[PDB]
Amino acid sequence: GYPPASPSNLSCLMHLTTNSLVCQWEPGPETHLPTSFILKSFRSRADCQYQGDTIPDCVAKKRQNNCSIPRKNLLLYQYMAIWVQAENMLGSSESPKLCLDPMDVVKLEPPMLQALDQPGCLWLSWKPWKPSEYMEQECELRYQPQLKGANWTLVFHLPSSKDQFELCGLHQAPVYTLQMRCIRSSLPGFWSPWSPGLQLRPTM
Amino acid sequence: AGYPPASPSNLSCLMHLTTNSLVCQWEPGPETHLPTSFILKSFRSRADCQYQGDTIPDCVAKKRQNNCSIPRKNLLLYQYMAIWVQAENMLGSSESPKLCLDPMDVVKLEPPMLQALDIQPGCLWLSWKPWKPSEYMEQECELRYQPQLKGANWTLVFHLPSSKDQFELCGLHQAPVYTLQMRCIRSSLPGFWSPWSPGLQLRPTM
Amino acid sequence: GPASSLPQSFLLKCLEQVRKIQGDGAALQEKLCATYKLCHPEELVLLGHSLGIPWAPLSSCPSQALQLAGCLSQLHSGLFLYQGLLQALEGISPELGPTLDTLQLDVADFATTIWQQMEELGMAPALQPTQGAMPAFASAFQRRAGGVLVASHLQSFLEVSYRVLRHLAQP
Amino acid sequence: ASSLPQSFLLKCLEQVRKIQGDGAALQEKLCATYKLCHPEELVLLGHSLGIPWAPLSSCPSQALQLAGCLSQLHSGLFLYQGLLQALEGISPELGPTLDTLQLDVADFATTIWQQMEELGMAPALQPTQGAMPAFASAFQRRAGGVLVASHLQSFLEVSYRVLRHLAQP
Numbered sequence: 001g002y003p004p005a006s007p008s009n010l011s012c013l014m015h016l017t018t019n020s021l022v023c024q025w026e027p028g029p030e031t032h033l034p035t036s037f038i039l040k041s042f043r044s045r046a047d048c049q050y051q052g053d054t055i056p057d058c059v060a061k062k063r064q065n066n067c068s069i070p071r072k073n074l075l076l077y078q079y080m081a082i083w084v085q086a087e088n089m090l091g092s093s094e095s096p097k098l099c100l101d102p103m104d105v106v107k108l109e110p111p112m113l114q115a116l117d118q119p120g121c122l123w124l125s126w127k128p129w130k131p132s133e134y135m136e137q138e139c140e141l142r143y144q145p146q147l148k149g150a151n152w153t154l155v156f157h158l159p160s161s162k163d164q165f166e167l168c169g170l171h172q173a174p175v176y177t178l179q180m181r182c183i184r185s186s187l188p189g190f191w192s193p194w195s196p197g198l199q200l201r202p203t204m
Numbered sequence: 205a206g207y208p209p210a211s212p213s214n215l216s217c218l219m220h221l222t223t224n225s226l227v228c229q230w231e232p233g234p235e236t237h238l239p240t241s242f243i244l245k246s247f248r249s250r251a252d253c254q255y256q257g258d259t260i261p262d263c264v265a266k267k268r269q270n271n272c273s274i275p276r277k278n279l280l281l282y283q284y285m286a287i288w289v290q291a292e293n294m295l296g297s298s299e300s301p302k303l304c305l306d307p308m309d310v311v312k313l314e315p316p317m318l319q320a321l322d323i324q325p326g327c328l329w330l331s332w333k334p335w336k337p338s339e340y341m342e343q344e345c346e347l348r349y350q351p352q353l354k355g356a357n358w359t360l361v362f363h364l365p366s367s368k369d370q371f372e373l374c375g376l377h378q379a380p381v382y383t384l385q386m387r388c389i390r391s392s393l394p395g396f397w398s399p400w401s402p403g404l405q406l407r408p409t410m
Numbered sequence: 411g412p413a414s415s416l417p418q419s420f421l422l423k424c425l426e427q428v429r430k431i432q433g434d435g436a437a438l439q440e441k442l443c444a445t446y447k448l449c450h451p452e453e454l455v456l457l458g459h460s461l462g463i464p465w466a467p468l469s470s471c472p473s474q475a476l477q478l479a480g481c482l483s484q485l486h487s488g489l490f491l492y493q494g495l496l497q498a499l500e501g502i503s504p505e506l507g508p509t510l511d512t513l514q515l516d517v518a519d520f521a522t523t524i525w526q527q528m529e530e531l532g533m534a535p536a537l538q539p540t541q542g543a544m545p546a547f548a549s550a551f552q553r554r555a556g557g558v559l560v561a562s563h564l565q566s567f568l569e570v571s572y573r574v575l576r577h578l579a580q581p
Numbered sequence: 582a583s584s585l586p587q588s589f590l591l592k593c594l595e596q597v598r599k600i601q602g603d604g605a606a607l608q609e610k611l612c613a614t615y616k617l618c619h620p621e622e623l624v625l626l627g628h629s630l631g632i633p634w635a636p637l638s639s640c641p642s643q644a645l646q647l648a649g650c651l652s653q654l655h656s657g658l659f660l661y662q663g664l665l666q667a668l669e670g671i672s673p674e675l676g677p678t679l680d681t682l683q684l685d686v687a688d689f690a691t692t693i694w695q696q697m698e699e700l701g702m703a704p705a706l707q708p709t710q711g712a713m714p715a716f717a718s719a720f721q722r723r724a725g726g727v728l729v730a731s732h733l734q735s736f737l738e739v740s741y742r743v744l745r746h747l748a749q750p
């Protein structure tokens with residue numbers, strides 16, 4: 001059949017690098033006719049019941065099944081209704097409306113963890129991903145002696161940055177792997193990915 | 205006629221402190237016309253429900269009832285568990301996506317016991333204790349008050365303690381009668397707000 | 411920084427379990443006093459040695475913050491012990507079976523909860539707590555007194571635990 | 582216990598920071614692009630160009646149990662919202678950087694207003710824009726930028742302390 005069906009798994013992430021809300025969806029059945037997807041939206045208030053100012057439609061590029069709303073069109077720190085509409089020569093379909101505040105779906109990148117510049121000790125230092133430095137963050141640091149049995153040891157609720165952080169109790173292997181990830185403190189947000197593994201050597 | 209089962213949706217669970225059991229309800233979709241059966245299945249897990257722990261006894265649904273209850277004796281409170289519902293029809297089977305919760309994260313709260321106090325102009329004294337069955341839970345409350353008038357506007361007080369022996373609220377000069385209500389929520393952990401307590405209509409002083 | 415080897419959600423749930431159980435033991439102690447006018451554990455003090463009511467220590471808690479494997483380990487052994495003592499009371503009596511069963515399931519799960527957390531973070535000792543030596547409680551009275559005592563010890567154990575946990579919750 | 586919901590105060594603190602980072606970006610650009618690096622050197626022009634200082638009449642708690650402190654925070658943000666608009670972009674090299682700062686200030690002002698309405702704390706007399714200083718020449722727009730950025734910055738440093746207190750995370 002050819003009627004476009006209601007799209008799904010619609011998600012949006014606020015990209016601080018490009019300062020734009022990026023939304024991606026699942027079209028489904030590969031129709032054999034000239035179809036088109038338009039990311040539609042309007043400013044609203046919490047719970048998205050107040051049909052506010054219409055935000056310019058974002059027409060998806062030809063192959064790509066995603067569109068980006070430039071920040072010049074968003075009102076940060078206020079809710080908005082977003083949905084995608086499929087227009088085909090034989091019908092239309094819409095996705096259920098999503099209700100978010102772009103700042104609640106900010107895509108974070110891992111913090112800058114480094115060995116700083118005592119027996120069985122290590123000194124660390126970390127600063128957050130600069131574009132998000134304005135965000136109060138909380139981080140987890142995970143460490144393990146690099147051995148055949150991958151057992152992760154955690155430190156929770158660490159600050160977004162530390163000039164020098166002395167970690168000790170590291171004598172179970174000559175070298176340890178360390179990673180750190182962060183998340184927005186006290187407000188909605190997703191964890192960042194774990195930073196690339198740091199392989200450091202504990203002072204002998 | 206006859207059609208095979210549709211994968212159940214809008215599956216939710218709430219922990220009832222009154223009955224001390226996790227109650228889950230779902231949406232079965234299109235009627236099938238066939239004697240169909242639903243079984244709430246689950247297993248204890250860990251956060252993110254990746255960990256495949258112990259099997260909790262299946263909970264089979266009474267006919268036409270679109271909900272099942274897991275008794276406390278079968279739950280391990282304060283640890284996550286994976287829950288899904290399964291539809292078995294003479295022409296097929298379907299399952300809902302798996303839900304991951306800790307029974308205690310979805311406790312269904314009832315409003316606090318707010319009462320006036322049997323004791324300067326425009327004052328009121330209040331007292332509140334939380335809903336007894338949930339007294340072991342640290343809660344935070346919001347109180348709303350408004351003068352009884354032409355489209356009165358709600359005035360709020362946030363981050364109130366779970367209980368207060370006497371709480372003085374003053375400067376209430378807009379009318380001879382004010383309405384007050386209070387609702388609570390679990391503090392610092394997952395939980396839904398309770399409903400607002402039934403309106404108290406109290407007369408300020410003077 | 412306010413670092414800690416324990417997640418905060420976990421610590422807050424522990425504090426809530428402590429209160430829930432503290433409220434369960436209170437109910438049990440109320441019942442025993444109402445039903446059998448056995449109201450002051452102090453009066454029964456000497457029967458603890460006589461009956462062999464074990465004690466659960468907490469020596470490893472006011473002296474560590476980012477290294478707490480020993481502290482959780484003890485909290486668990488203790489809760490595990492009282493889980494056994496309460497079981498030994500064989501329900502005390504029909505009138506008390508319900509009240510005590512609530513208390514015992516709540517204590518068992520709290521102990522279980524603590525174990526599984528220790529496993530997840532990688533702390534669980536290879537040695538599962540060799541279940542403590544379980545008391546006799548040979549008569550009705552022994553069960554009734556034992557109950558008052560066990561409840562009294564559980565209570566003291568949880569007051570200390572509450573302080574230890576409350577502290578960890580803010581590092 | 583407060584008259585304000587913690588989530589609001591926490592978002593306020595984040596907008597202040599976001600905005601303080603936007604102004605730094607601006608001041609960096611002006612210093613990089615036109616070697617205009619020390620606002621102290623332009624101090625005297627706050628007079629010639631008529632650039633006001635947004636007032637924050639010690640707002641810990643006034644005749645208003647918060648109704649007012651927010652009122653001031655909003656008036657200030659509202660003012661800088663205007664001053665930044667008067668700079669008519671400064672120049673093509675800076676338009677982007679300034680537009681970001683301007684939008685972020687506008688929204689923060691909006692956000693505060695709407696919260697005030699939700700709580701019934703909104704001032705009774707809605708703000709009418711004041712006499713906006715004109716930035717005639719390119720230089721006036723460039724120096725004006727450095728100045729407004731510098732005032733906004735001092736305004737946000739105080740606001741952060743005020744809000745940080747109301748919160749106590």
Ligand SMILES: *[C@@H]1O[C@H](CO)[C@@H](O)[C@H](O)[C@H]1NC(C)=O
Pocket residue numbers: 009011
């Ligand atoms: C939804 O989309 C995300 C992002 O593309 C994907 O990783 C995930 O597996 C999808 N989940 C479902 C249930 O479709």
Ligand SMILES: *[C@@H]1O[C@H](CO)[C@@H](O)[C@H](O)[C@H]1NC(C)=O
Pocket residue numbers: 214216229
């Ligand atoms: C999902 O199911 C519950 C239980 O029947 C219902 O109360 C709720 O309103 C449903 N969702 C929506 C958006 O109605």
